[PDB]
A = this chain, B = another copy of it.
């Protein structure tokens, strides 16, 4: 499991009494002990179960070994600052992440965050993404990043940045006083 997720333990057998023990004070007498929610690295270890039958016989102790994975460090996103419209928008971070899923004003759904890699500015295979002006996601507003661990499946969310894209003023009109003598 990855930190913050739930550790689900339980058995499928039938008995007069159940006895569970484990790491960080864990204990239970049920077939399905309450989930260990918001699991931490301290909860990793060996969970064990012994079962007592109505005939007074006691079964052999068996085990479940639960590993807990760390999430990637919280990344710090840095933008190019108050970029002028038409210039390439670059969002990056110094934190090393396997994959990086960028959440813009259009984010957090499968119709936007399509298959990673290739020409996909919102789901890259490293921490830096470049968004051209001719791109649906070239938008100002609050951006964040999710670091994806490609080995464990763990995710860690970033800080939030306000991307500012400035407008280029219109071609100005220029007028004069009309014909003038030499």
How far, in whole Å, are A18 and B78 apart by their CA atoms in the complex?
A: 53
Residues of chain B within 8 A (CB-CB) of A109 are: 73, 75-76, 93-96
One of A31-39, A63-71, A169-177 at the interface: A31-39
Chain A contact residue count (CB 8 A cutoff):
36
Residues of chain B within 8 A (CB-CB) of A108 are: 73-74, 76
| Chain A residues in the interface with B (C-beta under 8 A) | 6, 8, 10, 21-28, 30-35, 42, 45, 73-76, 78, 93-96, 105-112
**CB-based contact B25/A33 at 8 Å:** yes
Residues of chain B within 8 A (CB-CB) of A32 are: 21-26, 45
**CB-based contact B42/A107 at 8 Å:** no
